[PDB]
């Protein structure tokens, strides 16, 4: 897979006063997220957790608590200003993980190379009754 | 995050840093007994004056013994919380970074054994504060209203 | 693995779920079982939050993607604290 | 009065639990093929008629018992 | 600058559309494939902002809708005046209003309801009323059925005229944007034009018609030979006989020696023992001074000339250190989004309705009003209800604005930005205050009740036990009772009589007002009110502040204003839309209003209302057990709720029997609401499915495919039925009780 | 100075499990003793009603 | 209170309360062990039904005993 | 006594209706024909396709307990 990650660097942050939507104990103990994109021009955009702020020129760096907010902001940036982006996960050990594209091409369209994790080749009605599988680990949809 | 004058100011940070719950330059047991005697002197007042025997000449001892009992219950609760959350050889979870960024030694107050010393100190101090409030409220008791 | 996603061969490869997946779970892969020659896939069920909006879109006979519930975790619960 | 009310409410609760655990039996342990065409599997085939007729009895009794009451009132 | 620009004939008055429902919504106009179509049709009729994208057309539409509303109001007024003219005993009531029950509605003798036309005195039979029109019609010196008749006619004329104006302004001459969006001249006029000149012309109608005829009636005369109004202005000599100063034309006014008119324009204050009402001289001075004040206020803003301010030139100057740039640009927000204006105006209107409700009882303006008990009570509680509803609507539409038309890119602001930037702190602290008030205002009642049922009365919360004193209220009352001494020499007595100083006003063996003392029970009830209000504010403010996006759902706004949930994911996401926040807050507002009105009823019937003996001993309607039985919930049951519910429950076989019947249906619906509030949908969907099968079996399956109501509509119908049940119950209770005993 | 007194006069009160044991057994014993030795002057329960009560309706039963 | 107000409201409220307790001095030292989360939906329904039943039994039982104890006839 | 007996029969028939609908329609109706694979008590099956609040058979027992209490009262 010639789809390498980008190893999220430490680049400046958007101009924002700092507010009660930031991180909490969770981010400092378990995990948090960082979304990163390059911007075309200093404009205004509403952060997910409150108010609005301005971005800068070049690459950006925003931190957030949960992946859902990051991806919501990313879809907003892709449907409002037509720019690409990534977001990374961080662990308190110091690890950094690359999550969303996994190839660079959106998961919206086809790109061979992805495996087939979690298919069942039978219509929904073919599932069986729990009695046939009771007292076991298996379930009907498996 | 937001930093208003309340959460960020010289005098407020000074005050909060001076009270025993954050002055890491003292043994945890001593901070515990200090907060204990503080709350002991604290709670005797309303418990005694407004208790269910206030119209009786025993109301003093009554309120004081009730305060002592509440202190004992809360010390039990402290020890229970400590044994629940703090393991016996694992590290601390106290803030080890100050405002400037001086990497602070892990607060022994935030350890199992340290929490135990704290609990014992708090209990002894609460008892002492309650009995002191009693002796100052019912022997040398002119300049007050009660 | 907290929740669970299943996909069935009545998938018409219309690709509404992925466009509506809030937390980047599903995707498409090359198949031979429809015109669009593409079927769903769920290799990212960890971040599966559990909202049915995905299968609230699949315009098939009854359904083609099911979201079976299971145990809970820290990320499957939208926790942020 | 106390004994009567006691026993009646207990009977009601047990009666509800009965149908509850019956539905549980259907959900968890009923097998289709081990019961092909038997009276049990014969019930399910026309649940619509049963539900409809129960709803009809309910509607009749409700409408008329409420009508008479409001008229007298 | 500003001109009269309009446009000509956009839409033609053609019935082409009336036969095609849902012409406005593209989807609705296609056809009802199922039954939810006919719910969705009504559900979004008035939703103008979801029918276009430009403010011009929706502004025209709301301009026409306002005319529709005004036409309905005029028709209602006309119906009222008619029923007063042709179907009342109003003349007999004017003969002597001390012990003659106002009745203005008779019922047809068909189905045994003749008993409804009960005995009301004065040789009349009819359903007794409590609207309180009669005090007004006696204030304005109507005193003749011809006047009611012609007024009803004129009201009908104005109604048809307004309906016309509506049709014409929408269809033929539609206003343009630069007209609507021009708020400067609108403020200028409405300040100077509408309110000021209104109060001025009313002062006219009072000093030239009402005042003399009212003074004559107080002297005591059959209104038959009372001189007609116009015969009091044409021939001056009558008013001359009344008021010497009034026979001096216009010299004492223009020549600045206004003190001559002191007789009919004065500043007495207090009430008038002849009728307990207000000294009409005072109310005339009031209306006139208010007219002058509004006129001088109206001249603020520059409209076309070179003088005057600009509503853009006022905000941007204010910019403090903490907030920063201040109100810059807010002028654009409140000029480019109708919902914002609707919310602001609804909030202010609800507050004004509440304060009107309050100021009414404590200062009875009309004559012979503070002695028709039921009228006073019913007016107060009605105004309270209207205010509550208006406030909730304000919050809802504020949330709608927050969702749809808010955007920082062009409708920017630096104040609201800060507000939203720390919403969590606001909601957290308000929540904690709500918990604190709940505890220390209800647990007190619980403690008092318990320590009562345990045979420890001397450990209760009352005057006879551990004591809580509302010292600030008594302080203010003392100040208001000693203020006419030095601070306000131009007055004669206290501003009202409810202040803790003076005597009592009683007419026809009944009392109207007297001093009002405050006991610990008043402290407790006031804190209950404060707590419930704080909780309602918490609900609604949380809804508004979190309508955009919460820390649970990141992009709530994109999902729209009104949607049921976001699926059972992430542990369940039921009731997250601001719409559901309003659905919740409605119940709490209902509870606040209910407890407030109960407190009012008990306090009045236990400390003010009642009868006065020949010697002067007062025996109140309920015996004055408030300060000793309002401090136990069990008391509320026993002393007030159970006891004073007698007259409604024995009401069968009497004139008041109607008030009895509702007392059950009110409860019934009240029940019924639960069926919708508790259940869900899928169950009903499956039941409807089986019923559709049962029908289809007989070739009766209708093409309008049956569908159990959608979730949001289920919650809506539930809350509507619940509010209806509660309000109808308290309504029947109040009317039956007060009109029977009082 | 005060640190040594505070340490020594509360020295056995440092072990935590021992602390739970001591506090619980002491609280139980203390409340049991004070309630068994409750004086009637401050408790309206430690003495009887001491008055002839009221008979219920329908005679006495 | 449990049959009407469904979860998401209380979930957001718990979020706010959690942030509050987290950023408060003298209490941030005390941590929690189970992240506070509003009850589940079926759990809601259950506890609401339990409350309904308990109240609807206590009320009528006390009334039934008292009405015939005050009179014994 | 006649009117009260009729009201009691109403309560009986409608409570029976609730419970039997919960029993027979537990395997699955056209709203969710494969319900038999979701176990007994589940929150719901999503807000789409018409909304599916209170569709488990546990929820049927839930909605029946109310009428049981009512009839016994
Ligand atoms: C609203 C909060 C509140 C406050 C401030 C007080 C205040 C007080 N209570 Mg109390 N109490 C409350 C709620 C409250 N109570 C409730 C809700 C209950 C019922 C669970 C009780 C049951 C209660 C008892 C049983 C007793 C008190 C007693 C007391 C007094 C000590 C003090 C005046 C005691 C007392 O009367 O001493 C004077 C006492 O014996 N309270
Ligand atoms: C209902 C509330 C309440 C009540 C009735 C009392 C009652 C009392 N307090 Mg008190 N107190 C309270 C709350 C209360 N406290 C709180 C919240 C604090 C803050 C920690 C204090 C801090 C305090 C101090 C510092 C002192 C008292 C003291 C007293 C006593 C004498 C008061 C006097 O004459 O001056 C009296 C028994 C005085 C005393 O000698 O106590 C015995 C004293 O020195 N109180
Ligand atoms: C109070 C109350 C009332 C009156 C009802 C009535 C009913 N419920 Mg119900 N329910 C309630 C509370 C109530 N519920 C509560 C609190 C719950 C717990 C959530 C439930 C849970 C529940 C379930 C789970 C089920 C019912 C069912 C039923 C129906 C049973 C059939 C019957 O007797 O028809 C009686 C019919 C009526 C009382 C309606 C007549 C009302 C008037 C007369 C209509 C005409 C009025 C007016 C003249 C017309 C104009 C009105 C307007 C235009 C102004 C009936 C409609 C069952 C059902 O669907 O049966 C088929 C069913 O499955 N209910
Ligand atoms: C105060 C009452 C009031 C007023 C003034 C209006 C005003 C209006 N409604 Mg309306 N409406 C109301 C109550 C009201 N509504 C209620 C209670 C309902 C039931 C939910 C509806 C349902 C409704 C629908 C379904 C539609 C309107 C429409 C309209 C608009 C054109 C109607 C028209 O010209 O008829 C003129 C009628 C006459 C001159 C006389 C007829 C008799 C207008 C803004 C229409 C609209 O806005 O479509 C874009 C439309 O299609 N209304
Ligand atoms: C708010 C408007 C309103 C309402 C609710 C009613 C309501 C009623 N009218 Mg009515 N009416 C109204 C306006 C209204 N009217 C107007 C504006 C006129 C003048 C054209 C009339 C003229 C009128 C007559 C002449 C009669 C009624 C009658 C009635 C009753 C049948 C019913 C109570 C009838 C009635 O009550 O007879 C005793 C009857 O005969 N009305
Ligand atoms: C704060 C301003 C204010 C206040 C306190 C009152 C107070 C009162 N008004 Mg008034 N009113 C006002 C403004 C006000 N009004 C304006 C701006 C207009 C136009 C009117 C027109 C108006 C009318 C037509 C009437 C009153 C009446 C009354 C009495 C009932 C009182 C009524 C009255 O005169 O009582 C006898 C009455 O009929 N008002
Ligand atoms: C003069 C004030 C005013 C005005 C202009 C409006 C106008 C509007 N409101 Mg609104 N509202 C008001 C007061 C007002 N309301 C108040 C006081 C409340 C609090 C109770 C609300 C609560 C409210 C909610 C919760 C919602 C609206 C909505 C709407 C919009 C669609 C109307 C609709 O669907 O009803 C059509 C007409 C009916 C449904 C008739 C109902 C008749 C009642 C229920 C029967 C009982 C009456 C006795 C419309 C722009 C809705 C909206 O914007 O949808 C997107 C919406 O969701 N409003
Ligand atoms: C008294 O407020 C007065 C204070 C003065 O603020 P500014 O002078 O910066 O605000 C100018 C005003 O015109 C508002 O724009 O208001 C604030 O600082 C906002 C925060 C209020 C904090 C209230 C805490 C409760
Ligand atoms: C007349 C008379 C008589 C007779 C009587 C009789 C005979 C009666 C009967 C009665 C009856 C006869 C009754 C019945 C009842 C029934 C019931 C009550 C049922 C129930 C059911 C259920 C509960 C079910 C369940 C389930 C399900 C849900 C599903 C499946 C599974 C199961 C089974 C679990 C004599 C001569 C003796 C004497 C005189 C009088
Ligand atoms: C709130 C409300 C109400 C009430 C209302 C009212 C009461 C109103 C009033 C209003 C008013 C009170 C109005 C007024 C107006 C006035 C005006 C509009 C005037 C005008 C005038 C003019 C125009 C004149 C001119 C002139 C002449 C001719 C002579 C002199 C000179 C001059 C040139 C100036 C009711 C409850 C019923 C219903 C609901 C709502
Ligand atoms: C005859 C008939 C029947 C039956 C019926 C019934 C049974 C009914 C019932 C009913 C019930 C069981 C109840 C009801 C109730 C009602 C109500 C409840 C109404 C109300 C209305 C209104 C309109 C009100 C109003 C108001 C108030 C009072 C408050 C607020 C203000 C206002 C003015 C809004 C049958 C089916 C046989 C057949 C068909 C016909
Ligand atoms: S389920 Fe519907 S959406 Fe998801 S893949 Fe199959 S077809 Fe496309
Ligand atoms: S079931 Fe009804 S309520 Fe529960 S989540 Fe799905 S939609 Fe919201």
From TrEMBL, chain D:
Subcellular localization: Membrane; Plastid, Chloroplast thylakoid membrane
TM segment ranges: 9-28, 49-70
Quaternary organization: The PsaA/B heterodimer binds the P700 chlorophyll special pair and subsequent electron acceptors. PSI consists of a core antenna complex that captures photons, and an electron transfer chain that converts photonic excitation into a charge separation. The eukaryotic PSI reaction center is composed of at least 11 subunits.
Biological role: PsaA and PsaB bind P700, the primary electron donor of photosystem I (PSI), as well as the electron acceptors A0, A1 and FX. PSI is a plastocyanin-ferredoxin oxidoreductase, converting photonic excitation into a charge separation, which transfers an electron from the donor P700 chlorophyll pair to the spectroscopically characterized acceptors A0, A1, FX, FA and FB in turn. Oxidized P700 is reduced on the lumenal side of the thylakoid membrane by plastocyanin.
Entry similarity comment: Belongs to the PsaA/PsaB family.
Protein name: Photosystem I P700 chlorophyll a apoprotein A2
Residues of the full protein shown: 369 to 441 of 734
Automatic annotation (TrEMBL), chain E:
Ligand binding (chlorophyll a 5): 169
Residues annotated as binding phylloquinone A: 684
Membrane topology: Multi-pass membrane protein
Gene Ontology CC terms: chloroplast thylakoid membrane; photosystem I
Positions annotated to bind phylloquinone: 679, 709
Binding-site residues, chlorophyll a A3: 675, 683
UniProt: chlorophyll a 8 binding residues: 208
Positions that bind chlorophyll a 6: 188, 299, 303, 305
Protein name per Swiss-Prot or TrEMBL: Photosystem I P700 chlorophyll a apoprotein A1
Organism: Hordeum vulgare subsp. spontaneum
Lineage start: Eukaryota, Viridiplantae, Streptophyta, Embryophyta, Tracheophyta
UniProtKB/TrEMBL annotation, chain H:
Transmembrane regions listed in the UniProt entry: 2-24, 60-73
Subcellular locations according to the entry: Membrane; Plastid, Chloroplast thylakoid membrane
Residues annotated to bind [4Fe-4S] cluster: 44, 53
Domain of life: Eukaryota
Stated family: Belongs to the PsaA/PsaB family.
Function: PsaA and PsaB bind P700, the primary electron donor of photosystem I (PSI), as well as the electron acceptors A0, A1 and FX. PSI is a plastocyanin-ferredoxin oxidoreductase, converting photonic excitation into a charge separation, which transfers an electron from the donor P700 chlorophyll pair to the spectroscopically characterized acceptors A0, A1, FX, FA and FB in turn. Oxidized P700 is reduced on the lumenal side of the thylakoid membrane by plastocyanin.
Complex and partners: The PsaA/B heterodimer binds the P700 chlorophyll special pair and subsequent electron acceptors. PSI consists of a core antenna complex that captures photons, and an electron transfer chain that converts photonic excitation into a charge separation. The eukaryotic PSI reaction center is composed of at least 11 subunits.
Protein name: Photosystem I P700 chlorophyll a apoprotein A2
Gene (name only): psaB
Parent-protein residues present: 516 to 588 of 734
């Amino acid at each position: 897979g010639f789809v390498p990650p980008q190893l999220d660097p430490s680049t400046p942050s958007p101009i924002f006063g700092g507010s009660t939507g930031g991180l909490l104990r969770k981010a400092q103990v378990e995990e948090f997220y960082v979304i990163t994109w390059t911007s075309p021009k200093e404009q205004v955009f509403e952060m997910p957790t409150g108010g609005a702020a301005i971005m800068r020129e070049g690459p950006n760096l925003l931190k957030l608590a949960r992946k859902e907010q990051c991806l919501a902001l990313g879809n907003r940036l892709r449907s409002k200003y037509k720019i690409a982006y990534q977001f990374y996960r961080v662990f308190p050990n110091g690890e950094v993980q690359y999550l969303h594209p996994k190839d660079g091409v959106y998961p919206e369209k086809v790109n061979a190379g992805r495996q087939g994790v979690g298919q069942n080749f039978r219509s929904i009605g073919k599932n069986v009754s729990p009695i046939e599988v009771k007292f076991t680990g298996k379930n009907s949809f498996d | 995050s937001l930093e208003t004058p309340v959460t960020s100011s010289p005098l407020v940070a000074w005050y909060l840093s001076n009270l025993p719950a954050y002055r890491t330059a003292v043994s945890p047991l001593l901070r515990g007994i200090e907060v204990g005697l503080a709350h002991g002197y604290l709670l005797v007042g309303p418990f005694a004056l407004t208790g269910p025997l206030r119209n009786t000449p025993v109301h003093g001892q009554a309120g004081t013994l009730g305060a002592i009992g509440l202190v004992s219950i809360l010390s039990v609760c402290l020890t229970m919380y400590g044994v629940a959350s703090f393991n016996e050889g694992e590290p601390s979870t106290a803030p080890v970074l100050t405002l400037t960024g001086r990497k602070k030694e892990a607060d022994k107050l935030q350890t199992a054994e340290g929490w135990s010393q704290f609990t014992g100190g708090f209990f002894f101090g609460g008892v002492s504060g309650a009995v002191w409030a009693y002796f100052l409220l019912y022997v040398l008791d002119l300049p007050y209203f009660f | 693995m907290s929740h669970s996603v299943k996909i069935y061969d009545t998938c018409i490869g219309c690709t509404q779920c992925v466009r509506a997946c809030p937390t980047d779970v599903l995707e498409m892969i090359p198949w031979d079982g429809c015109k669009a020659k593409q079927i769903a896939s769920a290799p990212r069920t960890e971040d599966c939050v559990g909202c049915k909006r995905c299968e609230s879109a699949c315009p098939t006979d009854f359904l083609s993607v099911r979201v079976y519930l299971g145990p809970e975790t820290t990320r499957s619960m939208a926790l942020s604290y | 009065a106390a004994l009567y009310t006691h026993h009646q409410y207990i009977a009601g609760f047990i009666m509800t639990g009965a149908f509850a655990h019956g539905a549980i039996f259907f959900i968890r342990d009923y097998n289709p093929e081990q019961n092909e065409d038997n009276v049990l599997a014969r019930m399910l085939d026309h649940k619509e008629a049963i539900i409809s007729h129960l709803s009809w009895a309910s509607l009749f009794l409700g409408f008329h018992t409420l009508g008479l009451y409001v008229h007298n009132d | 600058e500003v001109k009269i620009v309009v446009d000509r004939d956009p839409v033609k008055t053609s019935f082409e559309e009336w036969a095609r429902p849902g012409h406005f919504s593209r989807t609705l106009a296609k056809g009802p494939d199922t039954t939810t179509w006919i719910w969705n049709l009504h559900a979004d009729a008035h939703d103008f902002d979801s029918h276009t994208g430009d403010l011009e057309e929706i502004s025209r539409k709301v301009f026409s809708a306002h005319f529709g509303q005004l036409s309905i109001i005029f028709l209602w007024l006309s119906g009222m005046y008619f029923h007063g003219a042709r179907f009342s005993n109003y003349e007999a009531w004017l003969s002597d209003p001390t012990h003659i029950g106002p009745s203005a509605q008779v019922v047809w003798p068909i189905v045994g309801q003749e008993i409804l036309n009960g005995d009301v005195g004065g040789g009349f039979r009819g359903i007794q009323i409590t609207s309180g029109f009669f005090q007004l019609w006696r204030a304005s010196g109507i005193t003749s059925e011809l006047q009611l008749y012609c007024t009803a006619i004129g009201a009908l004329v104005f109604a048809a005229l307004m309906l016309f104006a509506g049709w014409f302004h929408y269809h033929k001459a539609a206003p343009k944007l630069a007209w609507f969006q021009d708020v400067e001249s609108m403020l200028n006029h409405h300040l100077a034009g509408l309110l000021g000149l209104g109060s001025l012309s009313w002062a006219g109608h009072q000093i030239h018609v009402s005042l003399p005829i009212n003074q004559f009636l107080d002297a005591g005369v059959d209104p038959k030979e009372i001189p007609l109004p116009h015969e009091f202005i044409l021939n001056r000599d009558l008013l001359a006989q009344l008021y010497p100063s009034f026979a001096e034309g216009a010299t004492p006014f223009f020549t600045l020696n206004w003190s001559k008119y002191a007789e009919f324009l004065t500043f007495r204050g207090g009430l008038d023992p002849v009728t307990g009402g207000l000294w009409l001289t005072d109310i005339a001075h009031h209306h006139l001074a208010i007219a002058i004040l509004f006129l001088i206020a109206g001249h603020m803003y520059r409209t076309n000339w070179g003088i005057g301010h600009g509503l853009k030139d006022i905000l941007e100057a204010h910019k403090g250190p903490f907030t920063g740039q201040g109100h810059k640009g807010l002028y654009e927000i409140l000029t480019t989004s109708w919902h914002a204006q609707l919310s602001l105006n609804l909030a202010m209107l609800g507050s004004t309705t509440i304060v009107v409700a309050h100021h009414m009882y404590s200062m009875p303006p009309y004559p012979y009003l503070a002695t028709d008990y039921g009228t006073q009570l019913s007016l107060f509680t009605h105004h309270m209800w209207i205010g509550g509803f208006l406030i909730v609507g304000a919050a809802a539409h504020a949330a709608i604005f927050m969702v749809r038309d808010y955007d920082p890119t062009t409708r920017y602001n630096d104040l609201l930005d800060r507000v939203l930037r720390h919403r969590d702190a606001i909601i957290s602290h308000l929540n904690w205050v709500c918990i604190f008030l709940g505890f220390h205002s209800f647990g007190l009642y619980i403690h008092n009740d318990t320590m009562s049922a345990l045979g420890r009365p001397q450990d209760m919360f009352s005057d006879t036990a551990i004591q809580l004193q509302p010292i600030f209220a008594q302080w203010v009352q003392n100040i208001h009772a000693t203020a006419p001494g030095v601070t306000a020499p131009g007055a004669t007595t206290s501003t009202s009589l409810t202040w803790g100083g003076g005597e009592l006003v009683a007419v026809g063996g009944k009392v109207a007002l007297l001093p009002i003392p405050l006991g610990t029970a008043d402290f407790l009830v006031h804190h209950i009110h404060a707590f419930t209000i704080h909780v309602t504010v918490l609900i609604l403010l949380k809804g508004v502040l979190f309508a955009r996006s919460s820390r649970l759902i990141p992009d709530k706004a994109n999902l729209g204003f009104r949607f049921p949930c976001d699926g059972p994911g992430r542990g369940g996401t039921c009731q997250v839309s601001a719409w559901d926040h309003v659905f919740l807050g409605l119940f709490w507002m209902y509870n606040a209003i209910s407890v407030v009105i109960f407190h009012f009823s008990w306090k009045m019937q236990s400390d003010v209302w009642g009868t006065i003996s020949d010697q002067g001993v007062v025996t109140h309607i309920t015996g004055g057990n408030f300060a000793q039985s309002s401090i136990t919930i069990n008391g509320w049951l026993r002393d007030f709720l159970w006891a004073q519910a007698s007259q409604v429950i024995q009401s069968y076989g009497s004139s008041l029997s109607a008030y009895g019947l509702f007392f059950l249906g009110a409860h019934f619906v009240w029940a019924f609401s639960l069926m919708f509030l508790f259940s869900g949908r899928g169950y009903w969907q499956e039941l409807i499915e089986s019923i559709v099968w049962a029908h289809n079996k007989l070739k009766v399956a209708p093409a309008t495919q049956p569908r159990a109501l959608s979730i949001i509509q289920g919650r809506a119908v539930g809350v509507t039925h619940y509010l209806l049940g509660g309000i109808a119950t308290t309504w029947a209770f109040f009317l039956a009780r007060i009109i029977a005993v009082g | 100075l005060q640190s040594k007194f505070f340490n020594t006069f509360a020295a056995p009160f440092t072990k935590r499990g021992l602390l739970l044991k001591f506090l619980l057994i002491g609280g139980g014993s203390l409340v049991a003793y004070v309630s068994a030795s409750a004086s009637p002057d401050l408790l309206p329960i430690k003495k009887g009603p001491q008055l002839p009560p009221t008979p219920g309706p329908r005679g006495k039963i | 209170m449990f049959l009407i107000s469904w979860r998401g409201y209380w979930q957001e409220l718990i979020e706010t309360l959690a942030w509050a307790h987290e950023r408060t001095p003298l209490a941030n030292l005390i941590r929690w062990r189970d992240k506070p989360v509003a009850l589940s939906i079926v759990q809601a329904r259950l506890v609401g039904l339990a409350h309904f039943s308990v109240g609807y039994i206590f009320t009528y039982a006390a009334f039934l005993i008292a009405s015939t104890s005050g009179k014994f006839g | 006594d006649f009117l009260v007996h009729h009201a009691i029969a109403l309560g009986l028939h409608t409570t029976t209706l609730i419970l039997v609908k919960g029993a027979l329609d537990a395997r699955g109706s056209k709203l969710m024909p494969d319900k038999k694979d979701f176990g007994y008590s589940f929150p719901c099956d999503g807000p789409g396709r018409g909304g599916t609040c209170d569709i488990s058979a546990w929820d049927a027992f839930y909605l029946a307990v109310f009428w049981m209490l009512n009839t016994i009262g």
